[model samples]
Target chain A: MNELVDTTEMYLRTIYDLEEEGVTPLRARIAERLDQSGPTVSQTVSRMERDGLLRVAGDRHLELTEKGRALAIAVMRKHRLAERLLVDVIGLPWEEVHAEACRWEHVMSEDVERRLVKVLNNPTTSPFGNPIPGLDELGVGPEPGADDANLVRLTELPAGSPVAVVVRQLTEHVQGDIDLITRLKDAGVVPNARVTVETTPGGGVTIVIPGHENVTLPHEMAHAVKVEKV
Target chain B: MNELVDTTEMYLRTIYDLEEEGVTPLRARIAERLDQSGPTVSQTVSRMERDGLLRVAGDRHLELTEKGRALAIAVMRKHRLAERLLVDVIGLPWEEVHAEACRWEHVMSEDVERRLVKVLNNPTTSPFGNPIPGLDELGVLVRLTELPAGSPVAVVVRQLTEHVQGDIDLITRLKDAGVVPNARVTVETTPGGGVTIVIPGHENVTLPHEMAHAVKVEKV
Candidate 1:
């Protein structure tokens, strides 16, 4: 059933999170995160390894095979898309949307997700500024170092400029940053917005942007955005 | 973590199908259908019972508790709603939409569901004519016996006559025999829309007006 597949997805996500955190996830670490016993984690890992979803190194470190990584990324992509749809389309509250979306992500069909993406007008990034992979890439997205290299560093942009955000690095340890970025997007201080960094140059950055009313972003907040020149 | 809950939902949907077929689900039957062992089924059922979702009789014939029935109804409601939205709003192919909606039924949020309902204009039955619960009760709806009492009511109306108008008309005729718009009726029968009212005070009522048209049945 789909639930069984989702359990595998959870393991893959945990492994993906561990890998993002610069730690080689072991069975024991996954067990700790999932609140299962070490033996259970080991059995699940071995099953995943046999199913071409994982690979084990030195009897400890856990790594996703290419197939596993692709599945994890797909699930993550659904999660991010659900979050965006809930926040932007449904106007759900910030605190409830993520947890609700986490529940919906596994249940949503590819068809519904695609419809949501279309209805949301083809969003490129989630509420947290993390790009929804394979969305904008529909054949026009370029390779990393290609001539049309897509990158957005908000710090480098001039005041009152427009740019598109391309990506957000995913790290489990940065949950607070992720939550903050999501809130910023919900508040409209996000990537792809035309912003003007307004403070005078005094070893600090500040910006005034459009809002329900005009609003200001401190240097630290402004720098969090990454964009491509518009 | 949520996968276990999803599995339970799947089982509940399966049990609903079984109940619809007039058979009480047995643990062995559920396990066989789910391709799980008896112990696994027993464990799951134990948890579901603790959650107030199901009950098993002395013969081990399983039945849905009130909560379980409500959950099944909710799933079916979502499935039908999604089906309507797919066809009416998205222009999806009919053959493809049902299967796609089946998967989406278990996942959509209440907000998304309401938005889809708005687009579908609050349908009571799907394109296939299966009754969708909750939606039937969500808006201005009435039972067959609640029409005008011994007064002429218009049969022809528009605006809210899309999905179940035929059923309404059938019920209307059964409630009053001489019921037609602008038709004066002598109270030969009761206040229902059945075929017992005398037309223009005639002794013999000739027409068996079928009340299958599910209209708003307002008195003129």
Candidate 2:
């Protein structure tokens, strides 16, 4: 959106996403994510360093400078909001929206982005539960019902009041698994949806909904679906 | 790759616009409209004519061959559909969407364009009032400058040319003067200046010679 060209902005945004995923932002990883050649990425990374948008640590990990972070976050903000529009409004499947959002993110003007946030009702996260970069804080969860005893992971649903609203999903931990989110959505276990959770004596969980068939979710996927009692 | 493809499609779409305006699609008008140098337009158009994307008639007026028209209309469809997304979905000011859609038009995939129509509820026109190329057929519309400067005659605005859409000042003023599509207004042409459109309650807005040509209207 600034002096940075579209490809440069893509590089910056990719680094930010990697950072959020807690992966070391290495040139190799960045190259892999962006599908760029090693030499091409190296040249770009060098240019970024020259322009004060990045700093490569001695350990060869890439870190965003404050200036770089701002630009990167701007792309992330637009990307997530575009994702919201692609899914919430355009009726694109959650799986299909990311690639379209990638193109849309680069083209969004601040005016469009501002209007989009308003039209979409200022969503706090992408449909996949990744916090929109600027609208919500990074690393820290949304702090769902902060300090309320009612809040608990899906793995620990209260026995009697088994029905609860899905508060958040820790998608970063799951690598944004399309199938997992798809299954969760099919089972009515998405954000703000009231779902009954039945924990098996043996470390399994069943997402119970009347219209939807019972989804027997494995332990790993269940942990990512956070919930709070109604 | 996108550079040459983008330019060819741009020329095709511009020729289509001139045809809609009932103006001869001469190199001079297209060069002026598209901001391309005359020499560049000459060479590119000649190459395109040879390549069958266009055919230059005896008057040097341009026309698309069947294959050429398909490509051109595809670009127009994408462009108008993109404008719908920009204005109807993203809420860009009507004055601001055309420029953005120019770039967006090139990048849209078939899937996105198909999805966009459904999402935008099958709009027949862009926010600026041009009938989107494929979904609707353009009706016979008289340019504001071409209409007789008679007593105030009630009419409805139907479409605005690219030239009209790019004039942000004129568009904003038109909006302020209540001259948007489907808005009924009475038109009068003055002797020296251009046309004047008056929507009963709003202040009368006069168009200069250039702006008048870009506005297309039909009898109410």
Q: DockQ each candidate and list the results.
A: 0.17, 0.25
True contacts kept of each: 0.28, 0.35
Q: Chain A TM-score, candidate 1?
A: 0.60
- Per-residue CA lDDT of model 1 for A101-145, tens digit only, reads 655656655666666666667666677556565453232243355
Name the regions of candidate 1 deviating beyond 4 angstroms.
A1-5, A14-47, A56-63, A80-101, A107-129, A134-182, A194-230, B1-5, B21-33, B37-43, B90-92, B96-102, B135-220
- Candidate 2: Cα lDDT at B158: 78
Local accuracy of candidate 2 as per-residue lDDT tens digits, B103-175? 6666566677777878888787888788777543221177888777556788998777777776788888888
Residue B153 of model 2 has an lDDT of: 80
Model 2 Cα lDDT, one tens digit per residue, A161-228: 35646555444333245675566666656667777777766666777887887877676556556666
Clashing pairs in 2: none
In candidate 2 the C-alpha lDDT for residue B116 amounts to: 83
Worst 10 residues of 1 chain B by lDDT: B157-166
After superposition, the stretches of candidate 2 with alpha carbons farther than 4 Å from their true spots are: A1-5, A136-230, B1-12, B24-61, B85-91, B136-140, B149-152, B190-194, B198-204
